[PDB]
Amino acid sequence: SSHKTFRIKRFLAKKQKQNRPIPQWIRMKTGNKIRYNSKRRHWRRTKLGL
């Protein structure tokens, strides 16, 4: 809602900041084995815990 507490807002901010693609230079590292961020969360598909 518009009314939210500071803890809820900060939790949402962290979940926002970690919902981004991997940097492209990561895949050039030695022995990477990572292709794409598998922890991507879309707002409509998967809902947050809180």
């Binding site: 500071f6 807002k9 900060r10 949402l12 901010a13 962290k14 926002q16 900041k17």
Partner: protein, 60 residues
């Protein structure tokens, strides 16, 4: 417009800006951004030009 520590209040922001930029400020408005960083709108006193201050800071 500044990005400030989320734990700093308006008085602290005002005093910090005054001390480390040698300017006098009129008021401070404060919000916390959706990414969690605090943003401060610091209006300067009428006898200080925010354009010149931003030029000295180097953010033009």
């Amino acid at each position: 417009v500044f990005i400030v520590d989320v734990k700093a209040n308006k008085h602290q922001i005002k005093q910090a800006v005054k001390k480390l930029y040698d300017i006098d400020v009129a008021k401070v408005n404060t919000l916390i951004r959706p990414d969690g960083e605090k943003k401060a709108y610091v209006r300067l006193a009428p006898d200080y030009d925010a354009l010149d201050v931003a030029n000295k800071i180097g953010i033009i």
